[PDB]
């Protein structure tokens, strides 16, 4: 968790972060991308 | 990143504290001024010339830098002589004026006022009344330094110091004054920045901020107004550059306004460069800042571009290119040039007129006031840290290439290269060959087999041709310079045909010598008369001839000669257009074999030993001489061979033997190899194109911004280039032009890269970090086809397999191949047809991004093959364990035989038809190389470079049967670096020098580590003798179903036995081949006369020749027994006793002593190997020196003599000298002195000839001394004691 600084807009050990799931936003990316012949074209 | 033409290194670094402004006390100011030497204390010559007290420019400090000269001082400037004098005077005389108004003793503890003190001193020099300034020459630190100037008095009249209520308008100082003899012309003079002028600026000092608005507002018409936001010097000033522009820094006159920016920006950069945490600087930055009449939007004017770069230079950014401590015009201009170069005006920090936005996350800590806003860009790429300066590389530094992830597409990664590559690149050749000769003796009178002189290998067609000759010539010059070698080479051999005895002398001491051909006199002549060449006695007189002798008459060996005979008639004339050329040679030899004394030694030199001349020679002079040997000393690629005739006796019988056929055949077999090799090289003086195979292709970039994760051209060209020259070198340089900084990146593009690059499907990127790190100037590029030194004997061998594996893998049916232990970076990818599917493997990770290669064609497996696990799921029809198999046995700390005992069976299971393993077994001899490989016998192991690496080995026989027991049906065969040096297009082909003398070493290093080539796909051979002895008929049987095949066994890269059963031409000995129907195998009744490794080839009428195994006739039992004569019947008289030496006729023995690291042939009169057809004998003459210095019978080969058998005669070494007989006291050697002492009394001295010899002592009839160039006194009878 050693401080980084700019590589990415957020530090992990950064000030006031917060793990907190909300039944509202089910985390996630994009797995079901459609590529099948007819559907991709 | 990069701002315009300037490149900025990632790390940000600035001083972290500011020293509180300290005002000079009145006393210190008094001492500074009244010091012995003002130079350094007050002013300082920027570039003071040692020779003469002369200084072009002088940068000045405080109480002086303020001063601005009046016109009379500018016009007619003074020399550094009267300048030191002028100041050393005025500085003192000024202290007077000022001190008499303020007696130091009472008021020294009062701080002088920086400002007034300046104007008060500058005005004193210009000789202006200084009354007014004194009134307030001091001020209490509490009241501002610039305020006391106002509070004390608002005097708006004194020119150069107008004090108003809020501002003090004074003419800027002159941080640089130029003494007569200064010119901005020279690039060397220190960058003055126009300050050598009097009025280039106008420093406006202000009291308060509102006082400043009123100022800017009022001087808003002026070109521009620079102002120091970071802790101004004496209080906030407001520099206003005059309108004029300086000449020198840019072709385009740079405005004085913009120049001041560069000069400062070039500080904040150079200062950031070395500012450290521990140090406290005055200002956290030295960069100026435009406050008026400045265009904020565009980026044209040098000023705008500079300004734009200073808003960045306040963050701690440092220039990759080291900015000199004392900027010089050449340098300033090279920066003002880099600034002008089209680029992208940094955009992270927008510009303001009253505020410098500084990154919060940056080293720079804002002063105080309202000038620094902590603005934070959305994404600044720089992080902090510094860089320790590294000195300029004395030579172009090579850069190993390590790859990145992203890869460019061949199409794009091509033009990228072709948009910045140095195409028609001029390149030097240097010298590809620097070594000695690769001599090769051949006994024609030796071989007992008759060989029809009509059917020899006649001169190959191509030989005489525009293309071939062009190369034969090119190669010639590519050899760093030749007779000194050749001539000496022939004599190294001629020294072996010397018979000292009376029975039949040959080159007997003081023999006369004829010599034809000289340029002054041949350099070898000096040596023959010196007896320098060991083994050969000093000839009585040498008679020169030829076309340019310069010391003898000029003869034309074609026709008749009017001179007498000579023991040795060394002929070296040239023949050069082929038939009359043959006549020329046949004629020359005819008269040279005429000038020789009856029983002499003629040494002609044929240029084209055609089977057209070989009939005429063996016909005309079929009698003339007794022996005959071809001595081809290959210095360069030519076919001129030397022939020596034995005893010039009328009734000889020099019949053409099979030896000749072999000798002659080996010669040509090599010119095809040496020619084919040289084809890869460009013709001298031709601009480098893409055509030349060995062409050196580079890529010169200008201030290239090699960036990671971006396909920007500079970093895109880097790809191609390295891809176009992988196995090579890749040397990168950085020369600093007074403009930008070019960085060529050449490399020797060979055919070994074309093979590799072809297999590449994409051109991978290179971690540009190493390149981005450099930041130091190296020497300019060179572009030279060859490096300067001859490659290590080890490489001559390695590049001997890269040609072998290349030719093996080139085979179609091979299909899928794997490499057990390829290098960390697959070095085998170059030696394989771009179509074959190979899978290199190694414990370490692969160096090349395996992704760029098509997966189907190239596979890579990690982990060792020594471990059973690795072999799960790896099936290849052919494996190659070259360069690894030896290290695995050592790594796994196991026995060599036992190791391959588990590997071979794995390759069988892996589904392998073929195998090639660079095993290290002494198949030729258990003899080792002194510096290359030591063969520890207590434990089967090697020592490549004795220690550097130790790897166990096996024996030819045990390992042979162990592998035959593993794969019973598989046919084995040993391929080894063949003397034809056909592998050459891998040493001369990649651009590496070598020694024609080392080829011998490597062909001996290759023998220590052969490449056991197995082939499960065919039946193995059957040799009836097994450890086959030389000169014994052996039974070999190739089991081929079809009788209609052609047997062609070839040894050394030259075929020796070829022909269907009926007729078989054999140059290796009597070979009777006959296909037996019953077994269906051609039973070859063969008896060899030459030991070696014969690769049997059975080729069918249709289709390529197919190898069917390889048997090896081993050299005869090397040993030496001597019929040493009894004490009595053996004398110390002149007639030397001779003990018949028992040794295989195969080895030629020669007496010598072991001096230093090599063996030096003893003189023939002292000892020698007189040989009668019935037996070879050791003739020797006893000398008192024999007890101290011992002799050795040594194996005489083209190589350094005495390596195979160097046994020391310890008998002739102990023969005790009696009291009743004369004894010969000689000298030990060419560099040793001695003295005799009979009965413990200094009897005489050999080293120094006694002015008068002792009773009964005289010089001997002969010169038995081992050195041959020393007398050999014979003493009476006594108890002499030789003491060397
Ligand atoms: C420093 O690296 C200490 C370890 C703290 C984080 C390591 C990884 C575990 C937490 C994951 C954060 C990112 C998404 C899980």
CATH of the domain at B722: 3.55.60.10
Smallest CA–CA separation between B992 and chain A, in Å?
46
Q: Do B361 and B220 share a structural domain?
A: yes
Distance of CA B332 to the CA centre of its chain: 37
Burial B197-206 (b: 16+ CB within 10 A, else e): bbebbbbbbb
Length of chain A counted residue by residue: 41
Minimal Cα distance from A8: which residue of B? Answer: B379
CB atoms within 10 A of CB B13: 24
Contact A5 B383 (CB under 8 A): yes
Q: Count how many domains chain B has.
A: 6
Q: Which atom of ligand 1 is nearest to the CA of A1?
A: 1
The pairing of beta strand B838-842 with beta strand B858-862: parallel
- Which residue's alpha carbon is nearest to atom 14 within ligand 1? A12
Number of neighbouring beta carbons within 10 Å of residue B693: 15
- Are residues B477 and B444 located together in one domain of the fold? yes
Residues of A in contact with B379 (CB under 8 A): 6
d(CA B1181, CA B1044): 62
SS3 assignment, position B860: strand
At B920, list the tokens.
């290290």
Length of chain B: 1284
Contacts of A6 in chain B (CB under 8 A): 361, 379-380, 383
* Residue A5 to chain B, least CA–CA distance (Å): 8
Parallel, antiparallel, or unpaired: how do β-strands B741-743 and B701-702 relate?
antiparallel
Instruction: Give B405→chain A minimum CA distance, Å.
Output: 19
Which sign, positive or negative, has the C-alpha torsion B12, B13, B16, B22?
Answer: negative
Contacts of B1241 (CB under 8 A, 6+ apart): none
Distances (CA, A) of B1067 to B657, B663, B667, B1098: 9, 10, 15, 17
Residues 345-374 of B with CB under 8 A from A: 361
B380 touching A (Cβ < 8 Å) = yes
Give, using CA atoms, the residue closest to atom 4 of ligand 1.
A1
Residues 6+ apart with CB under 8 A from B703: B2, B5, B6, B7, B338, B341, B740, B741
In chain B, what residues touch A5 (CB-CB under 8 Å)? 361, 383
Q: Spell out which residues of chain A touch residue B383, defining contact as CB-CB under 8 Å.
A: 5-6
HSE (side-chain half, CA atoms, 13 Å) at B1050: 20
Gap from B380 CA to chain A (nearest CA, Å)? 8
- Chain A interface includes B383 (CB < 8 A): yes
Q: Kindly report the protein residue whose alpha carbon is nearest to atom 15 of ligand 1.
A: A12
**Phi, psi (deg, nearest 5) at residue B266:** -75, 5
Compute φ and ψ for B475, nearest 5 degrees.
-55, -45
Strands (E), B825-964: 838-842, 858-862, 878-881, 914-917
Contact B708/A at CB under 8 A: no
Choose one of A12, A18, A29 to mutate for the ligand 1 pocket test, by most ligand atoms within 8 angstroms of C-beta. A12
Residue A12 Cα to ligand 1 midpoint, Å, equals 7
Interface probe for A, chosen from B1, B381, B383 (most Cβ of A below 10 Å), is B383
φ, ψ of residue B423 to 5 degrees: the values are: -65, -80
Task: Go through B1016-1053 and write b for each residue having 16 or more CB atoms within 10 A of its CB, e for each that does not.
Answer: bebbbbbbeeeebebeeebebbbbbeeeebbbbbbbbb
The residue of chain B nearest to residue A4, with distances taken between CA atoms, is: B383
Choosing from B680, B703, B729, the residue where a domain stops is B680
| Interface probe with B: pick from A3, A6, A14, most Cβ of B within 10 Å | A6
Question: Cα separations (Å) of B931 from B324, B392, B794?
Answer: 49, 36, 11
| Protein residue with least CA distance to atom 12, ligand 1 | A12
**CA–CA separation, B641 vs B1169, rounded Å?**
26
Q: Are residues B485 and B542 in the same domain?
A: yes
Question: Per the structure block, which two tokens stand in for B677?
Answer: 């090799």
Cα angle vertex B722, ends B854, B819, to 5°?
A: 45
Tell me which residue of B326, B55, B43 sits closest to B180, measured CA to CA: B55
Q: What are phi and psi of B742, to 5 degrees?
A: -70, 155
**Residues of the domain holding B50:** 1-388
Q: How far is the CA of A1 from the centre of ligand 1 (A)?
A: 6
Chain A: residue whose CA lies nearest to B380: A6
- C-alpha span between B937 and B928 (Å, rounded): 11
State which residue of chain A sits closest to B383, comparing Cα positions. Answer: A6
Q: Residue for token digits 């005097």?
A: B155
Determination technique for this entry? cryo-EM
**Whose Cα sits closest to atom 6 in ligand 1?**
A1
Domain limit, last residue, from B786, B810, B838: B786
Q: How many angstroms separate the alpha carbon of residue A7 from the centre of ligand 1?
A: 16
Task: Copy the structure tokens of residue B124.
Answer: 């004193």
Is residue B942 domain-shared with residue B1029, that is, in the same domain?
A: no
Ligand 1 neighbourhood includes A17 CB (under 6 angstroms):
no
Q: Which residue has the tokens 């500012």?
A: B275
Cα–Cα distance measured from residue B990 to residue B694, given in angstroms and rounded to the nearest whole number: 7
Which of B243, B346, B433 lies closest to B3 in space, CA to CA?
Answer: B346
Q: Give dist(CA B956, CA B192) in Å, integer.
A: 79
- In chain A, what residues touch B361 (CB-CB under 8 Å)? 5-6
On whether both B405 and B506 belong to a single domain, the answer is: no
Count of alpha carbons within 13 angstroms of residue B353, beta-carbon side? 13
Tokens of B719: 């790809």
CATH classification at residue B480: 3.40.50.10760
* Residue B569 and residue B628 share a domain: yes
Q: Give the separation between CA B574 and CA B588, rounded to whole angstroms.
A: 10
Interatomic CA distance for residues B533 and B697, integer angstroms: 47
Characterize the bridge pairing of strands B513-516 and B542-545: parallel
Distances (CA, A) of B404 to B32, B135, B709: 59, 72, 9
User: In chain A, what residues touch B380 (CB-CB under 8 Å)?
Assistant: 6
The span from the CA of B1015 to the CA of B349, in Å, is 71
The CATH number of whichever domain residue B1080 belongs to comes to 2.60.40.10
Domain boundary pick from B758, B786, B814: B786
The rounded Å distance from CA A27 to ligand 1 centre is: 18
Q: For residues B30 and B121, state if they share a domain.
A: yes
> Nearest residue CA, atom 11 of ligand 1?
A12
* Contact residues, chain A, for B708 at CB < 8 Å: none
Q: Is the CB of A21 under 6 A from ligand 1?
A: no
Distance CA B5, CA B344 (A): 8
Closest atom, ligand 1, to C-alpha of A13: 5
* DSSP letter, residue B363: S
User: What is the nearest CA distance from A4 to chain B, expressed in angstroms?
Assistant: 10
Residues B951 and B909 in one domain: yes
> Which atom of ligand 1 sits closest to the CA of residue A2?
1
For B378, nearest residue in chain A (alpha carbons): A9
What is d(CA B468, CA B960) in angstroms, rounded to the nearest whole number?
A: 43
B538 and B639 co-located in one domain: yes
CA of A9, closest CA in chain B: separation in Å? 9
Q: Which of A1, A8, A11, A21 most suits a substitution to test ligand 1, by most atoms within 8 Å of the C-beta? A: A1
The tokens for B185 are: 């012309």
**What's the reported resolution, in angstroms, to a tenth?**
3.3
Q: Does the distance separating the beta carbons of B380 and A5 come in below 8 Å?
A: no
* B694, B388 Cβ separation under 8 angstroms: no
Report the alpha-carbon distance of residue B978 to residue B804 in Å, rounded.
Answer: 10
- Nearest Cα residue to B513 out of B548, B487, B483: B487
The CA-CA-CA angle for residues B122, B126, B128, to 5°, reads 95
Integer Cα distance of B1079 and B539 in angstroms = 64
Q: Measure B379 CA to nearest chain A CA, in Å.
A: 8
Residue A8, min C-alpha distance to chain B (Å): 9
Tokens at B225, concatenated? 């107004």
3-class DSSP state of B1250:
coil
Q: Is residue A8 within 6 Å of ligand 1 at its C-beta?
A: no
List C-alpha distances in Å: B906 to B82, B900, B901, B1143: 92, 9, 9, 46
The answer on B1155 and B1082 residing in a single domain is no
The whole-angstrom separation of Cα B999 and Cα B979 is: 7
Q: Whose CA is nearest to atom 5 of ligand 1?
A: A1
Ligand 1 contact, A14 CB (< 6 A)? no
Burial label, B447 (beta-carbon count in 10 A; 0-12, 13-18, 19+): buried
2-21 in chain A: CB under 8 A from chain B: 5-6
Distance (angstroms) between ligand 1 centre and the Cα of A2 equals 10
Break-preceding residues in chain B (C–N over 2.5 Å): 481, 519, 576
Cβ–Cβ gap A5/B361 under 8 Å: yes
Is A41 in CB contact (< 8 Å) with chain B? no
User: What is d(CA B653, CA B651) in angstroms, rounded to the nearest whole number?
Assistant: 7
Nearest CA in chain A to B382: A6
Residue A37 near ligand 1, beta carbon < 6 Å: no
Cβ-based contacts under 8 A for chains A and B:
6
Query: Are B139 and B249 part of one and the same domain?
Result: yes
Residues B1026 and B880 placed together within one structural domain of the fold: no
Q: Is A4 in the pocket of ligand 1 (CB under 6 A)?
A: no
């Amino acid at each position: 968790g050693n401080v980084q600084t700019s590589v990415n807009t957020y530090n992990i050990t950064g000030d006031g972060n917060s793990f907190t799931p909300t039944s509202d936003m089910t985390s996630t990316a994009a797995p079901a991308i459609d590529l099948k012949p007819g559907v991709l074209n | 990143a990069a701002v315009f033409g300037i490149q900025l290194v990632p790390k940000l670094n600035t001083s972290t504290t500011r020293r509180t402004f300290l005002p000079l006390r009145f006393d210190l100011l008094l001492d500074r001024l009244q010091s012995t030497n003002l130079h350094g204390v007050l002013y300082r010559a920027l570039d003071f010339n040692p020779v003469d007290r002369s200084a072009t420019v002088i940068q000045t400090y405080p109480p002086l830098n303020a001063w601005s000269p009046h016109h009379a001082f500018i016009e007619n400037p003074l020399d550094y002589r009267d300048w030191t004098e002028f100041i050393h005077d005025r500085a003192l005389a000024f202290v007077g004026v000022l001190t008499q108004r303020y007696p130091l003793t009472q008021n020294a503890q009062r701080y002088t006022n920086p400002l007034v003190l300046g104007a008060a001193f500058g005005d004193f020099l210009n000789a202006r009344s200084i009354d007014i300034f004194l009134d307030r020459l001091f001020y209490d630190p509490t009241q501002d330094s610039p305020i006391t100037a106002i509070t004390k008095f608002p005097y708006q009249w004194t020119i150069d110091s107008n004090v108003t209520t809020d501002s003090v308008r004074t003419s800027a100082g002159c941080k640089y004054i130029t003494l007569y003899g200064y010119d901005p012309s020279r690039p060397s003079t220190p960058a003055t920045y126009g300050k050598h002028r009097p009025t280039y600026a106008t420093v406006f000092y202000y009291s308060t901020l509102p006082a400043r608005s009123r100022l800017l507002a009022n001087l808003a018409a002026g070109p521009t107004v620079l102002e120091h936001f970071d802790s101004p010097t004496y209080g906030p000033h407001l520099l206003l550059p005059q309108t004029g522009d300086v000449l020198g820094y840019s072709s385009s006159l740079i405005s004085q306004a913009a120049l001041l920016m560069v000069e400062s920006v070039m500080d904040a950069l150079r200062d950031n460069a070395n500012a450290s945490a521990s140090t406290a600087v005055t200002r956290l930055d030295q960069s100026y800042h435009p406050v008026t009449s400045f265009d904020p939007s565009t980026f044209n004017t040098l000023l705008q571009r500079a300004t734009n770069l200073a808003l960045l230079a306040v963050q701690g950014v440092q220039s990759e290119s080291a900015i000199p401590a004392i900027p010089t015009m050449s340098d300033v201009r090279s920066f003002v040039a880099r600034l002008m170069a089209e680029g992208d005006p940094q955009q992270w920090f927008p510009y303001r007129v009253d505020q410098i936005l500084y990154w919060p996350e940056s080293p720079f800590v804002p002063p105080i006031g309202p000038f620094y806003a902590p603005f934070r860009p959305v994404n600044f790429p720089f992080t902090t840290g510094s860089y320790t300066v590294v000195p300029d590389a004395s030579r172009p530094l090579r850069l190993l290439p390590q790859y990145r992830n992203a890869t460019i597409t061949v199409q794009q990664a091509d033009d990228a290269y072709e948009d910045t590559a140095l195409s028609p690149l001029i390149t030097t050749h240097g010298f590809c060959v620097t070594g000695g000769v690769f001599t090769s003796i051949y006994d024609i009178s030796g071989d007992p087999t008759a060989y029809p002189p009509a059917q020899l290998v006649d001169a190959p067609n191509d030989y005489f041709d525009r293309e071939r000759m062009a190369r034969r010539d090119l190669f010639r010059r590519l050899r760093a310079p030749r007779s000194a070698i050749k001539d000496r080479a022939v004599f190294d051999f001629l020294a072996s045909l010397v018979n000292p005895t009376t029975a039949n002398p040959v080159l007997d001491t003081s023999f006369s010598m004829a010599y034809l051909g000289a340029s002054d006199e041949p350099v070898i002549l000096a040596d023959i008369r010196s007896g320098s060449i060991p083994g050969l006695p000093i000839p009585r007189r040498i008679v020169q001839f030829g076309y340019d002798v310069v010391h003898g008459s000029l003869l034309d060996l074609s026709r008749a000669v009017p001179t007498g005979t000579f023991g040795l008639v060394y002929a070296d004339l040239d023949q050069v257009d082929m038939p009359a050329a043959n006549r020329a040679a046949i004629a020359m030899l005819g008269t040279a074999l005429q000038m020789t004394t009856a029983g002499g030694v003629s040494v002609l030199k044929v240029n084209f030993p055609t089977r057209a001349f070989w009939t005429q020679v063996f016909n005309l002079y079929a009698t003339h001489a007794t022996t005959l040997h071809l001595v081809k000393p290959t210095i360069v690629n030519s076919s001129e061979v030397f022939l020596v005739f034995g005893g010039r006796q009328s009734n000889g019988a020099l019949r053409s033997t099979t030896a000749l056929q072999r000798a002659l055949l080996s010669l040509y077999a090599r010119n095809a190899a040496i020619d084919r090799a040289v084809t890869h090289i460009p013709f001298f003086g031709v601009p480098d194109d893409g055509t030349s195979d060995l062409g050196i292709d580079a890529v010169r970039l200008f201030d290239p911004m090699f960036s990671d994760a971006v396909a920007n051209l500079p970093s895109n060209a880097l790809a191609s280039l390295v891809s176009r020259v992988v196995p090579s070198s890749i040397m990168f340089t950085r020369v600093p032009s007074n403009g930008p900084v070019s960085t060529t990146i050449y490399g020797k593009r060979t055919f070994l890269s074309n093979r590799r690059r072809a297999r590449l499907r994409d051109v991978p990127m290179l971690i540009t970090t190493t390149l981005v790190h450099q930041r130091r100037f190296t020497t300019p590029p060179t572009f030279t086809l060859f490096s300067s030194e001859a490659v290590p004997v080890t490489t001559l061998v390695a590049a001997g397999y890269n040609s072998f594996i290349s030719e093996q893998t080139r085979n179609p049916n091979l299909a899928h191949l794997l490499d057990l232990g390829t290098g960390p970076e697959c070095r085998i990818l170059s030696l394989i047809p771009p179509t074959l599917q190979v899978t290199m493997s190694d414990s370490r990770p692969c160096a090349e991004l395996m992704a760029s290669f098509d997966p189907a064609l190239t596979a890579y497996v990690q982990g060792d093959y020594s471990t059973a696990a690795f072999w799960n799921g790896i099936r290849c029809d052919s494996a190659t364990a070259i360069f690894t198999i030896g290290a695995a046995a050592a790594a796994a700390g196991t026995d060599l035989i036992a190791f391959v005992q588990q590997l071979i069976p794995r390759i069988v299971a892996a589904g392998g038809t073929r195998m090639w393993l660079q095993l290290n077994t002494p198949l030729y001899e258990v003899s080792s190389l002194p510096d290359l490989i030591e063969i520890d016998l207590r434990d089967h192991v090697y020592r490549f470079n004795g220690g550097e690496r130790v790897e166990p080995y096996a024996d030819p026989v045990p390992l042979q049967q162990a592998i035959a027991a593993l794969l019973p049906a598989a046919a084995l065969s040993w391929h080894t670096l063949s003397p034809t040096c056909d592998w050459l297009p891998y040493i001369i082909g990649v651009g590496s020098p070598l020694n024609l003398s080392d080829i011998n070493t490597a062909i001996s290093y290759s023998r220590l580590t052969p490449i056991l080539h197995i082939d499960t796909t065919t039946p193995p051979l059957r040799v009836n003798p097994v450890p086959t002895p030389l000169n014994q008929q052996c039974a070999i049987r190739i089991t081929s179903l079809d009788p209609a095949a052609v047997l062609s066994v070839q040894h050394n890269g030259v075929e020796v036995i070829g022909g269907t059963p009926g007729n078989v031409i054999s140059v290796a000995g009597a070979a009777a081949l006959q296909y037996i129907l019953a077994n269906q195998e051609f039973l070859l009744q063969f008896t060899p006369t030459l030991p070696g490794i014969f690769d049997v080839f059975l080729t069918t009428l249709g289709q390529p020749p197919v190898p069917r195994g390889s048997f090896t006739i081993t050299p005869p039992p090397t040993t030496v027994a001597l019929n040493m004569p009894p004490p009595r019947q053996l004398d110390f008289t002149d007639v030397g006793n001779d003990a018949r030496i028992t040794c295989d006729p195969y080895y030629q023995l020669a007496v010598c002593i072991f001096k230093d690291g090599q063996y030096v042939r003893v003189n023939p009169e002292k000892a020698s190997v007189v040989t009668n057809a019935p037996n070879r004998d050791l003739h020797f003459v006893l000398d008192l020196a024999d007890n101290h210095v011992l002799l050795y019978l040594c194996d005489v080969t083209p190589s350094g003599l005495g390596d195979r058998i160097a046994f020391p005669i310890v008998d002739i070494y102990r023969i005790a000298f009696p009291r009743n007989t004369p004894v010969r006291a000689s000298l030990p050697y060419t560099g040793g002195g001695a003295h005799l002492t009979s009965g413990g009394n200094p009897f005489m001295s050999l080293t120094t000839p006694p002015a008068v010899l002792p009773a009964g002592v005289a010089l001997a009839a002969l010169s038995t001394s081992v050195a041959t160039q020393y007398p050999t006194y014979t003493l009476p009878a006594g108890v002499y004691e030789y003491v060397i």
